Amino acid sequence: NGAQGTKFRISLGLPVGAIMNCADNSGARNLYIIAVKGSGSRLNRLPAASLGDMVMATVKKGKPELRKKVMPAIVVRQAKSWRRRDGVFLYFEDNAGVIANPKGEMKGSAITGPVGKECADLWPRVASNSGVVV
Amino acid sequence: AKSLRASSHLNAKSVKRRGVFQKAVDAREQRISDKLKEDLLKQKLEDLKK
Amino acid sequence: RIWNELYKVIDSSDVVIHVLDARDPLGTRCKSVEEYMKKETPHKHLIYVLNKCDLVPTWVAAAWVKHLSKERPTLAFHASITNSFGKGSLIQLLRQFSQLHTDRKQISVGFIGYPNTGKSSIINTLRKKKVCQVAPIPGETKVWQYITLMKRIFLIDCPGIVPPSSKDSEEDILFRGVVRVEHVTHPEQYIPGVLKRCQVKHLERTYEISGWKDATEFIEILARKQGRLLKGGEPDESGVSKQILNDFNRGKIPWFVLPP
Amino acid sequence: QLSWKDIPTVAPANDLLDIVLNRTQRKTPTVIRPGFKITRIRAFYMRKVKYTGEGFVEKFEDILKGFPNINDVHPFHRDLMDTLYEKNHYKISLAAISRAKLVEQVARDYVRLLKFGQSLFQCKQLKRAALGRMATIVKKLRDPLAYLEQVRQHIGRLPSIDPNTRTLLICGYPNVGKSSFLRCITKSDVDVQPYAFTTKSLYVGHFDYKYLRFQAIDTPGILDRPTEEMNNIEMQSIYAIAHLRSCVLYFMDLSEQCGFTIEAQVKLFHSIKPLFANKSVMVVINTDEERAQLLESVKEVPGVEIMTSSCQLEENVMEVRNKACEKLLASRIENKIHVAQPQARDDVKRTPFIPESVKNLKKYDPEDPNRRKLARDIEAENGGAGVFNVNLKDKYLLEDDEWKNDIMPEILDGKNVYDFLDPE
Amino acid sequence: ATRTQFENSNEIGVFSKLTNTYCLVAVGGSENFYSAFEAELGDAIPIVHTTIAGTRIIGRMTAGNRRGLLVPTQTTDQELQHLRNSLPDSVKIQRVEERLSALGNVICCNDYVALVHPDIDRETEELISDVLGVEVFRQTISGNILVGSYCSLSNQGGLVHPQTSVQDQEELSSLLQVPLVAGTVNRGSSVVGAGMVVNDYLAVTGLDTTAPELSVIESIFRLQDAQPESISGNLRDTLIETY
Amino acid sequence: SHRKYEAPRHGHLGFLPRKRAASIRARVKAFPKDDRSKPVALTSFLGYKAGMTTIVRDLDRPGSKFHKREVVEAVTVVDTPPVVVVGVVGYVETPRGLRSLTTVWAEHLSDEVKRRFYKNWYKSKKKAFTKYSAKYAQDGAGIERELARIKKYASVVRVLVHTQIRKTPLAQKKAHLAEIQLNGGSISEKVDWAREHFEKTVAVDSVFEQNEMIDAIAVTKGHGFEGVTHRWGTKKLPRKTHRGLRKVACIGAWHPAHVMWSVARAGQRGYHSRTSINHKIYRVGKGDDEANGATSFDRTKKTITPMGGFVHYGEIKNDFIMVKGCIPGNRKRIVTLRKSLYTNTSRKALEEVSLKWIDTASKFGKGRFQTPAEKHAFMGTLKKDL
Amino acid sequence: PQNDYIERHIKQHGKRLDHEERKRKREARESHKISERAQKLTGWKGKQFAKKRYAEKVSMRKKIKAHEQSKALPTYLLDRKFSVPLPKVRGISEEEMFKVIKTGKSRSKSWKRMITKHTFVGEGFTRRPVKMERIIRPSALRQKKANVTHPELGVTVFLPILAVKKNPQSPMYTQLGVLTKGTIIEVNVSELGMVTAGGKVVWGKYAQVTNEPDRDGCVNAVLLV
RNA sequence: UUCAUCUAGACAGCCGGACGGUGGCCAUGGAAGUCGGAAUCCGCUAAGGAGUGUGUAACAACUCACCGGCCGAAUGAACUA
RNA sequence: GCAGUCAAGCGUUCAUAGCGACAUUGCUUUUUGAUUCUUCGAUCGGCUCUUCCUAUCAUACCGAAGCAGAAUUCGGUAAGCGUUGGAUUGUUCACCCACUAAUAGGGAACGUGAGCUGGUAGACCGUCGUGAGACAGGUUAGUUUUACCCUACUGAU
Ligand SMILES: Nc1nc2c(ncn2[C@@H]2O[C@H](COP(=O)(O)OP(=O)(O)OP(=O)(O)O)[C@@H](O)[C@H]2O)c(=O)[nH]1
Ligand SMILES: Nc1nc2c(ncn2[C@@H]2O[C@H](COP(=O)(O)OP(=O)(O)OP(=O)(O)O)[C@@H](O)[C@H]2O)c(=O)[nH]1
Ligand SMILES: [Mg+2]
Ligand SMILES: [Mg+2]
């Protein structure tokens, strides 16, 4: 909920314990922590996801006012080899991170760099805050 | 969730079958019989080339 | 596991010494144990020992001793096998209690307090050799031990305790020697507390820098000085903050709380 | 705040006992044997005692946290719930439950005793003892839980009132008309039968005036009652009039109806005018000279305004409603947008481009027989939302219409048609 | 004005772009969003489903006026053909090569002026300055450089998000030549461009936007007979006690 | 004890025993239920698997997020030359099961089916059906008596057909033989259909058409003796464990006295007989008409067979069936296509699939060109040309 | 919401069409279903069902009784050996009282004995050193207060124990302070305000424990007046 | 097995009566047999409680307790095995 | 639990002895939800993998609840299918925060002793001992190695 649309499947690149980039100027530089929403439950398996997936995270590098604080938000770049259902495999330069509330609304107001097509179609406020899609 | 062998879902499917799906399933049978008969007639026509 | 050892030590003890750090005695006091000893066991004696008096001036020690002698005898002390202070006074007090307990055939003295206060070092100071293991890290004594002097006084070493008063904070628990700072995640957020507690003059005399602002900048200055930096140019703020927090407690940086 | 409805059910003592003990007998294992190790036996009975303690304290915590703190809420809600539930009884019951949450002491003590159990019989008897003391404690909670379940059901059904919002009270004598004023002005399920205390509670309604939410409050009744004796139904009205920051509409009903005389009406008004010192009052007459002297009676109060009107007509109602709202908003803003403009930078003309089609067009009446089909209904005709295949074509604009169902080739041998496709 | 919702979202940029002479919508499960526009508009103007690079986010992917329509590089040849076929020859449609592909966020426009992101120039953007339409301006809405999202516009009035200052509002209304106001949408939203689409005769927003917000929208856009923007004169203290 | 952590099983106990199949040609174990109201119709067909390929489609699927959008998909290609009818079997009902009481064969038969009956063909005198052809004399009293027996009794009728392997590039020379059920009505009319259809062919267009969901029954690609880890999907033990790490360590603490049928041991992986249902036909293409691989959108004359032919298979000079996805069996095998056993209440079996393009590039590497003309044009003139 | 809305709803519309007939039929079928639950409900549920039914029978019997019924010494001598209330109590073995405790890495020394039952040590206990203590009286099995009942007055009090005078098993146990059944203890009685002839306040009295507190955490006792 | 009812009509069913002082006294916004506290009487009777339950804001209405009419011979309760 | 009250029944061939179901009183500390929450001497826990029980955590179907709807509580049939990822060894007979539809309990070992992995010989500190040495302790380092036999199991003739 909060997202507009179905649970669609794109390959997994970002297990738990993965530091990925934030490039907006909300203040953060990095995102780490545990959790992935809509993750299964299997013995010995890591929670790892994308598809504009929402995840729990902390600022490892950034301002202290928002360090030490767990927060939800959404994957926008992955750098794994994803497949578009229209032809080719896609992949980015890097992973990218960035911050929001549980309804999908952003703490920041603009995004740097490209954002995934399916991530923007699934999350409206990301599409409004993004100037660059793909 | 509702299982595969749930009575309500199976009743709903039973109601759907008699309608829009059986018509499409029955049209194909007439089409394919009409093709089967012509594939006999063409073989007869080729037999009558001698 | 620790509090079982605490109550065992108390029940075995005839006297209970309460070791305080002269930097922060009211922080290191543990009042709940004193209340338990009041209600449960009035036949025990419950005296105070200010330790690490060599780290603070003499007038601070005198002030705290005056403030605490109103309620409990409160000796002052400095623990060292070579250069000590208060040894004879404490010996005199213990043999006083022995003379009072003339029928028991022996008298046991427990050592209670926060971690890293100097219980093992006080015992090693009384015996005048290394009897108990000692380390600047908090939890070196993990289980009790009996030690003998006079054939009539039995010292008991106890592990350290902190009550779970939730008015306390992780910062307050850090700035008392309790935790090993190697295991905490972001040691940088606590350096403002270090600046708050310590004096800029001592702090610049210790590291020999100068004139900083902004503890985040303080760390990077100290790291550029020590050559303590990563593969690239990012100065290691985490390890430097860990070292600063170890120094603060171990007494490489002088600091002290004033009394009323 | 505002609808303390999420309180789990408070079961009676015997049912709570049955629940918490059967949960222990069901979830925790039930079989041990004498030939087993004493450690196994001890762990068995310890687990039972600990689970039984945890169940009771979970239940009691759901009561304590779910219920509100009658102090520490708001004075209005506090006084209301005090006159309803007897604050003393309320606090006493909840303190009884808090002190019973004793069970922890029993569990800890008997577990620490169980550590030294040297036989199955000893351990069994200690377990039985712990659970029996728990049962005694709960048996001594028979009446407070019966009280609290009733208070739960009532406080769940209470209405959500914000004391700070734009409010208006509707006051008067019993059997006046002030309740079907609420009925007419606002959606509200209230009874209007002709006798005194037809309503025994406060009823709320909402409306929107000037793009602002207001709330009207009907209050059951007040009698003239020299005020060191009055009932909990009238003290609701009194506390509501005293606390809230509203306007207040006193309905007089100048008529032989009402089963109440005009002298008594003005007497009640003069009795309760000390509450009116800061409350923005209006009087409404719902259709001889002394009876008129009794009206300038009340006009002589400093802040007041009289109106004559009806439940017979439905426009004076809205009239007087808007008057009450305007009276309130003024000293609201007292107790408490900038549009920019160009400044003449150029002469280039700008104007709205609109085609004649929309001005010639007809609005959409959803309840006309002859109207536009609007593809919603074409969907309804062909097949529902997930089955209807819309043709993206059939809307397109071409030179020839016979070529509707054509396709453009995209790829030839190696090349793409869109790259070579120019008009020239 | 009008309120409605498709799938369940108050943000209309997920679905649509709207001008005086055409309305683009996204293809969805149901024809209810299309019917919502067909009700108020009828067959009077083109109402056109289709995606942009198989995406629904078309008001935030596209931008245009009554004279034309700009679409990005990720747009396919088929969707481009579809728009060409479904729209008249009066609207010139063009595919743009740019780094910033979200034209409906990078640009806010009307039939007489346009604001843009301050970033890269172009040959045919410097040519569009007077070729296709008229004035372009590199400006910034209280630091928010995403003008098509953080500001709605038409020929009769303009809306900006509430953290905009009076000074900047006066500076920007000079460029646009028409009155501006700062407001919120859909129960306290700063993002107005996605939450709302508006023109010279009709407004569409979400179900959650309040009655004061609708009244301001109606005022500043001249919908009801008559609302020449100082009906705020009437609804002064409503907004006071609201905010 | 109670394992401390629940987890699902490793493997499916219904696909047991995991042994070699008793025949290369999987055996159809159920045909659809007969409705005697409807015309005479074959229930199945035979084919030979020939590689895979890739297609693009325009999807009119309402409710989906590729509605009115393009989709790339894999497809399987089965070489389906016409099937020849050679016999009839009648299967009477009993309170033990179904029993065959008579089988009738045709007058003339091919060297292919004779080779199927034989095991050393190059030495034999090939005396297979001589006396049966002699029994096909003046009036065929025996033939008509057994046919009348089938009309009278026998309840349900199957037809013995064979393939035309001669047409494929396969180097086998020996045809497969199969019983395929007739699912129309009037046993008399079934027998009459077969009697009229002896020595005659049935194409695949006369059994299937586009947008039909069919089932593939085949045998799956033996790999041989394999271990636990790859045959059931178990975890691996960390490293340098005792007596190896690619196995189950043990059963736990508790003590049984036997090893169970449920504990995931080693053995054969593959050559199992499998029945995979509901695959949608995308194209029924024909050898008579070239430009099979072409499309309404493409208009590029080419057949489906890629450059250099398929790998471990030749060219498609024959009628073929294209289905989506992955069927059991490898290239150069024998698959049976059955039709669905039940009316399917999914819109997937209603949508009229339309293709835009088919990939005819080389599968013997990274193919970049669809046609040798395209390769010629891109590469340009070489040294050898002129 | 807002008040008794369902009561209003029942007044305005009313409950259902099929409400009274169904209620009557439920009340009629309850007679069958009660017996059905009796011959069914195996186990704990049947046991509880029987308990409930028996209690309900007794309640109705008493109700009917109350209905139909509602249709020599003086006052001061009314209400009226030196043997204690518990002579000859069960005998306890030394094995059942003392548990063996073993010391050393290779536990080979035992010499230590833990008392398994509840105990009274005193006011100035102060455990012995470990090398010198043999008898272990653990802190959890250490009582300071008992639950003493006066046979007269029908009253009990939570009084502090002062001493142990006589445990009938092996008077070593008296010196250890073992509170087994039949044990005689001195308890303080200043809360009761007892006074002797002369005006001297009594603050100590003998009591006999009536329970086995190794099985119950309670030490319940009876005063010896 | 014991105790009770019965052609001066039992048990079960239907039907009717089920009254009068009196809306008994306290209490309350209101409470009349039926939210509660405490009396619990007399009259006329075949019998009819200062009232067994449903119900009403209060009355109302219905109901049982009790009596009678029709029916026409056995029936009920508590216990034991 | 101890000590009591009452009384349905039982009742030396007892009316005024005794026994006694169901109910019920006192003791446990308090009356105003402030309780700062506060541990007090036990002679194991963790991997792979299978199955079973129901005393059902979730999913499925029902009943009763002042159950408006939404959510939830209690309970009936039900073991078909699932019931996680991690932090913490100054220790965990455990707890902490997250994800989740849910993060239910147990057995087949522990009714002496049985896969794989953590938790004697040397040396040091402490208590004791005249001493050799022992322990109330604590720390550290420290070589079992099948199956090729029968059966079972898995595949193959
Ligand atoms: N300057 C100074 N340092 C002291 C004094 N006493 C102890 N220390 C230091 O404090 C460090 C930690 O204190 P400990 O001696 O271990 O006291 P403790 O934590 O109660 O000892 P344990 O019971 O073994 O945990 C030691 O390593 C000493 O170096 C003192 O009197 N003065
Ligand atoms: N003449 C006239 N009588 C009215 C009007 N509205 C209500 N009434 C009278 O009011 C009587 C009912 O009283 P309510 O409307 O309940 O007023 P209320 O009793 O004071 O309301 P509450 O105290 O809240 O219960 C009816 O018998 C009507 O005759 C009106 O508009 N005109
Ligand atoms: Mg230490
Ligand atoms: Mg009324």
CATH number at residue F124: 3.30.1430.10
Positions of chain H reached by protein Cβ under 7 A: 28-30, 56-57
Q: Which two three-digit tokens encode residue G48?
A: 């509880």
The DSSP letter of residue G43 is: T
Q: Which atom of ligand 1 is nearest to the CA of C121?
A: 15
Judged by DSSP in three states, A72 sits in strand
Let me know if chains G and D touch, i.e. at least 3 Cβ pairs under 8 angstroms.
Answer: yes
Exposure on the CB side of residue D286, measured as CA atoms within 13 A = 24
Contact residues for C210 (Cβ-Cβ < 8 A; gap 6+): C204
Judged by DSSP in three states, D405 sits in coil
CA distance B33 to chain F (A): 7
CA–C1' G45–I21 (A) = 20
How far apart CA C31 and CA C38 sit, in angstroms, is: 11
Write out residues whose CB is closer than 7 A to strand H: D 193, 195-197, 200, 223, 231, 233; G 11
Write the CATH number for F36: 2.40.30.10
Residue B23 touches chain F, beta carbons under 8 Å: no
CA distance F39 to chain B (A): 7
The annotated binding site of C for GTP is made up of 113-120, 157-161
How far apart CA A132 and CA A113 sit, in angstroms, is: 6
Judged by DSSP in three states, C157 sits in strand
Considering the domain architecture, whether residues F59 and F110 belong to the same structural domain is answered as no
Residues 164-203/C with CB < 7 A to strand I:
164-167, 178-180, 183
Q: Which two three-digit tokens encode residue D191?
A: 């009874």
> Beta carbon of G210 within 7 Å of strand I?
yes
Residues of chain C with CATH 3.40.50.300: 1-157
Write the CATH number for E35: 3.75.10.10
Please answer whether residues D105 and G212 qualify as being in contact, where contact means their C-beta atoms are separated by less than 8 angstroms. Answer: no
CB neighbours of residue A90 within 10 Å: 16
- Cβ–Cβ below 8 Å for E200 and D352: yes
Q: Is D177 in the pocket of ligand 2 (CB under 6 A)?
A: yes
Task: Quote the domain boundaries for residue D423.
Answer: 391-424
Instruction: Domain ranges for chain A, please list them.
Output: 13-134
How far apart CA G44 and CA D22 sit, in angstroms, is: 10
Considering the domain architecture, whether residues F208 and F302 belong to the same structural domain is answered as yes
- Cβ–Cβ below 8 Å for C43 and G124: yes
> If you take atom 3 of ligand 1, which residue's CA is the nearest one?
C52
CATH code for the domain defined by A13-134 = 2.40.150.20
How far apart CA D376 and CA D365 sit, in angstroms, is: 15
CB neighbours of residue G22 within 10 Å: 10
Residue from D178, D184, D168 nearest D198 by CA? D178
Measure C113 CA to ligand 3 centroid, in angstroms: 10
CA–C1' F210–I81 (A) = 37
> Beta carbon of C153 within 7 Å of strand I?
no
Please answer whether residues F45 and F337 qualify as being in contact, where contact means their C-beta atoms are separated by less than 8 angstroms. Answer: yes
Please answer whether residues F247 and F228 qualify as being in contact, where contact means their C-beta atoms are separated by less than 8 angstroms. Answer: yes
CB < 8 Å to C186, chain A: 67-68
Considering the domain architecture, whether residues F364 and F349 belong to the same structural domain is answered as yes
How far apart CA C173 and CA F74 sit, in angstroms, is: 63
DSSP-assigned beta bridge partners for residue A82: A90
Fold of C170-250: Conserved Hypothetical Protein Ylqf; Chain: A; domain 2 (1.10.1580)
Q: Which atom of ligand 2 is nearest to the CA of D219?
A: 24
Return the residue matching tokens 């045909």. F31
Q: Which two three-digit tokens encode residue E96?
A: 């743009």
Q: Which two three-digit tokens encode residue C158?
A: 């106890």
How many residues would you count in chain D? 424
CA distance B1 to chain F (A): 19
Task: Quote the domain boundaries for residue E11.
Answer: 1-225
Q: Which two three-digit tokens encode residue D13?
A: 């003592």
Please answer whether residues B24 and F195 qualify as being in contact, where contact means their C-beta atoms are separated by less than 8 angstroms. Answer: no
Return the residue matching tokens 């249709």. G71
CB neighbours of residue G6 within 10 Å: 10
CB neighbours of residue F150 within 10 Å: 24
CB < 8 Å to F63, chain E: 29
Q: Which two three-digit tokens encode residue D83?
A: 């006159």
CA–C1' C11–I91 (A) = 24
Degrees to nearest 5, angle at CA D386 with D381 and D388: 40
> Is residue F229 a part of any domain in this protein?
no
Contact residues for G225 (Cβ-Cβ < 8 A; gap 6+): G150, G151, G152
How far apart CA D412 and CA E88 sit, in angstroms, is: 29
Return the residue matching tokens 């032809």. A87
Residue from D96, D195, D85 nearest D138 by CA? D96
Contact residues for D83 (Cβ-Cβ < 8 A; gap 6+): D232, D235, D236, D239
Residue A68 touches chain C, beta carbons under 8 Å: yes
Judged by DSSP in three states, F199 sits in coil
User: Among all residues of chain E, which has the CA nearest to that of D345?
Assistant: E174
Looking at the structure of chain E, the number of domains it has is 1
Considering the domain architecture, whether residues F130 and F30 belong to the same structural domain is answered as no
Residue F277 touches chain B, beta carbons under 8 Å: no
- Cβ–Cβ below 8 Å for E27 and F68: yes
User: Among all residues of chain F, which has the CA nearest to that of A8?
Assistant: F65
Q: Which ligand is nearest to the CA of C138?
A: 3
Residue from D38, D125, D103 nearest G212 by CA? D125
How far apart CA E88 and CA E22 sit, in angstroms, is: 9
Which nucleotide shows the minimum CA-to-C1' distance to residue F241?
I116
Please answer whether residues A124 and E11 qualify as being in contact, where contact means their C-beta atoms are separated by less than 8 angstroms. Answer: yes
Exposure on the CB side of residue C170, measured as CA atoms within 13 A = 9
> If you take atom 7 of ligand 1, which residue's CA is the nearest one?
C118
CA–C1' D99–H76 (A) = 56
Letter for the amino acid at E129?
S
What resolution, expressed in A, was reported for this entry? 3.1
How far does Cα D107 stand from its chain's mean position?
A: 40
Please answer whether residues E126 and E166 qualify as being in contact, where contact means their C-beta atoms are separated by less than 8 angstroms. Answer: no
Q: What share of chain A is helix, strand, coil (3-state, %, to 5)?
A: 10, 20, 70
The method recorded for this entry reads cryo-EM
Looking at the structure of chain F, the number of domains it has is 2
- Which of C11, C15, C37, C100 to mutate: most G Cβ within 10 Å? C11
Interface of D with E in 73-92 (CB under 8 A): none
Residues 11-50/C with CB < 7 A to strand I:
11, 32, 36, 40
Positions of chain I reached by protein Cβ under 7 A: 1-4, 8, 21-23, 25-44, 46-52, 55-57, 59-61, 65-76, 80-86, 90-94, 98-111, 114-116, 125-128, 134-139, 152-157
Considering the domain architecture, whether residues F282 and F352 belong to the same structural domain is answered as yes
CATH code for the domain defined by C1-157 = 3.40.50.300
Within chain F, how many helices (H) and strands (E) appear? 6, 14
The DSSP letter of residue F374 is: H
Let me know if chains A and F touch, i.e. at least 3 Cβ pairs under 8 angstroms.
Answer: yes
Which nucleotide shows the minimum CA-to-C1' distance to residue D197?
H29
Residues 204-233/F with CB < 7 A to strand I:
225
Exposure on the CB side of residue F223, measured as CA atoms within 13 A = 9
The DSSP letter of residue D393 is: -
Considering the domain architecture, whether residues F63 and F155 belong to the same structural domain is answered as no
Residue from C192, C189, C162 nearest C177 by CA? C162
Task: Quote the domain boundaries for residue F316.
Answer: 16-81+203-220+270-384
Considering the domain architecture, whether residues F96 and F189 belong to the same structural domain is answered as yes
Interface of G with D in 2-21 (CB under 8 A): 2-5, 8
Please report the DSSP string for F316-337 in residue order. --S-EEEEES--SS-SS-EEEE
- Cβ–Cβ below 8 Å for D388 and F62: yes
Considering the domain architecture, whether residues F121 and F141 belong to the same structural domain is answered as yes
C235: left (phi over 0), alpha (psi -120 to 50) or beta: beta
